[PDB]
Amino acid sequence: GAMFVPGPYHAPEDRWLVDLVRGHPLAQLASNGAGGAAPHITHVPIIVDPELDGPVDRLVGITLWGHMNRANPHWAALGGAANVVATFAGPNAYVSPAVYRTAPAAPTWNFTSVQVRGELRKVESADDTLATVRATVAALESRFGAGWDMTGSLDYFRRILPGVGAFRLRVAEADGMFKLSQEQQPAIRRRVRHSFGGAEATRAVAGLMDRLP
Amino acid sequence: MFVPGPYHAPEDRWLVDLVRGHPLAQLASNGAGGAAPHITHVPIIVDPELDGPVDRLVGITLWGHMNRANPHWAALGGAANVVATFAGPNAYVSPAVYRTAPAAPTWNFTSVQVRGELRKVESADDTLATVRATVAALESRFGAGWDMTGSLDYFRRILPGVGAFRLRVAEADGMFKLSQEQQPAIRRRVRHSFGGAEATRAVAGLMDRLP
Ligand code: HEM
Ligand code: HEM
Numbered sequence: 050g051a052m053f054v055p056g057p058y059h060a061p062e063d064r065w066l067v068d069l070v071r072g073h074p075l076a077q078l079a080s081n082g083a084g085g086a087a088p089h090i091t092h093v094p095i096i097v098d099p100e101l102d103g104p105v106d107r108l109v110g111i112t113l114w115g116h117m118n119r120a121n122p123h124w125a126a127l128g129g130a131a132n133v134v135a136t137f138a139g140p141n142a143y144v145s146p147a148v149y150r151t152a153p154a155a156p157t158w159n160f161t162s163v164q165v166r167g168e169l170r171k172v173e174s175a176d177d178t179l180a181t182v183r184a185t186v187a188a189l190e191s192r193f194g195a196g197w198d199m200t201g202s203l204d205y206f207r208r209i210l211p212g213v214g215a216f217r218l219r220v221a222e223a224d225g226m227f228k229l230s231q232e233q234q235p236a237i238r239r240r241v242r243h244s245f246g247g248a249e250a251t252r253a254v255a256g257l258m259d260r261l262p
Numbered sequence: 263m264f265v266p267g268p269y270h271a272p273e274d275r276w277l278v279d280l281v282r283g284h285p286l287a288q289l290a291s292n293g294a295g296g297a298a299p300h301i302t303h304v305p306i307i308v309d310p311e312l313d314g315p316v317d318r319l320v321g322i323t324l325w326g327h328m329n330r331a332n333p334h335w336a337a338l339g340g341a342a343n344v345v346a347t348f349a350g351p352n353a354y355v356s357p358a359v360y361r362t363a364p365a366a367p368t369w370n371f372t373s374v375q376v377r378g379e380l381r382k383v384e385s386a387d388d389t390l391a392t393v394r395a396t397v398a399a400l401e402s403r404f405g406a407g408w409d410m411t412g413s414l415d416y417f418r419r420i421l422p423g424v425g426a427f428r429l430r431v432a433e434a435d436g437m438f439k440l441s442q443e444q445q446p447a448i449r450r451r452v453r454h455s456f457g458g459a460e461a462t463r464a465v466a467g468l469m470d471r472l473p
């Protein structure tokens with residue numbers, strides 16, 4: 050694959066990858082830099098095709114929707130059909146060997162990531178640009194927000210729309226890192242799960258550890 | 263890295279503070295033949311031999327490692343121009359918090375992007391120096407007083423799989439997107455709403471520290 054994920058760190062099910070994309074829509078969008086420059090990286094909001102009905106169990110084959118600032122050089126750098134990766138970063142925590150209570154050991158960092166790759170297609174119609182930002186509000190306000198109603202701002206969205214660079218990303222490949230102590234003996238994995246259960250900052254990691262088979 | 267004027271850190275030390283607080287970077291390099299970039303989550307620290315306040319990232323060497331069997335290691339080759347992105351506290355901003363109209367939602371977030379040449383460490387001594395300073399820095403900040411002494415032999419036994427590296431920072435940019443574009447009373451309402459739950463207090467924390 051285009052992402053290195055050791056055997057024990059594969060998600061139980063394809064659905065875990067879709068879940069992380071929905072949970073952490075603020076992706077890092079990467080494309081090659083010009084003439085041996087470092088990749089361009091932009092934090093961009095990205096959602097699953099809102100027109101999708103049926104349960105979404107796999108990212109491969111679906112289109113993702115996103116936007117960025119047109120004034121961002123990254124926008125002009127993407128040219129035409131640019132091959133890109135968007136990386137989505139889920140729950141994560143430092144793992145002290147103190148938690149293991151074993152010797153010898155080394156520390157690690159438990160973390161979740163999804164990398165999707167395919168060709169970014171820019172949206173140049175204002176109708177499709179407006180669809181992108183309205184679809185994003187509907188998906189993010191419901192999951193992360195405080196019941197705000199976009200209705201009073203629909204004209205405003207249109208009155209500020211030129212700055213938006215909207216895009217579509219057909220997922221050619223999807224890889225998921227779920228690094229959640231699978232490499233450890235079960236009694237040690239229990240100790241990490243129970244440690245992470247004891248603080249809010251680490252509880253989401255404990256929640257994924259608890260759903261592993 | 264594109265950073266709008268209002269989202270610049272007040273001081274260079276904020277970029278250093280974010281790197282220190284958020285060491286699991288996304289290391290990116292160019293994909294061969296117009297392919298998408300390679301991306302690896304790697305632990306990166308400030309040069310542990312820097313004694314005295316580290317105020318600026320430009321001019322300084324970052325230490326990291328990854329898996330040698332990771333194909334990203336082979337694709338780096340020697341003298342690759344890389345970006346390492348550190349991601350700090352972040353929270354979705356509901357315009358319900360603004361109590362104004364009209365409005366659009368955003369996402370407050372912190373990133374540091376560093377760029378320069380990645381040099382691969384080959385030296386056994388420099389490779390073991392890298393994972394021990396990584397234990398020293400991260401266990402201090404994130405750990406529970408764990409003593410690596412009893413495990414140094416074990417470090418040495420697994421060391422051959424370590425691909426350790428040095429990143430000379432040529433460029434460092436920091437996004438501190440923290441509602442600075444909003445009027446003062448709105449920034450105040452946002453900071454207040456983030457104050458009252460753990461998921462968001464770290465963002466309220468940085469919004470406090472803005473002048
Ligand atoms: C619903 C959640 C939303 C989030 C999380 C969000 C996030 C972002 C981010 C991170 C950028 C900067 C990308 C870059 O650096 O290149 C951006 C740019 C932009 N967004 Fe959105 N966005 C949202 C909704 C909207 C809506 C509803 C509008 C309405 C038109 C909008 C208009 C813009 C504009 C004009 C820009 C260009 C830069 C600027 O003028 O601020 N956004 N958005
Ligand atoms: C203290 C915190 C540490 C963290 C957060 C950490 C993190 C990581 C990560 C994320 C990778 C995978 C990179 C990739 O996917 O290519 C990795 C690989 C590796 N690290 Fe570390 N590391 C730490 C300390 C150490 C220590 C002390 C050793 C001792 C020798 C070590 C040995 C390795 C080895 C051998 C690999 C190759 C991957 C493997 O064998 O699974 N690490 N490390």
Ligand SMILES: N[C@@H](CCCNO)C(=O)O
Nearest residue numbers: 154155156157158232420
């Ligand atoms: N994967 C290692 C952990 C050491 C730090 N990172 O590799 C191991 O279990 O040997």
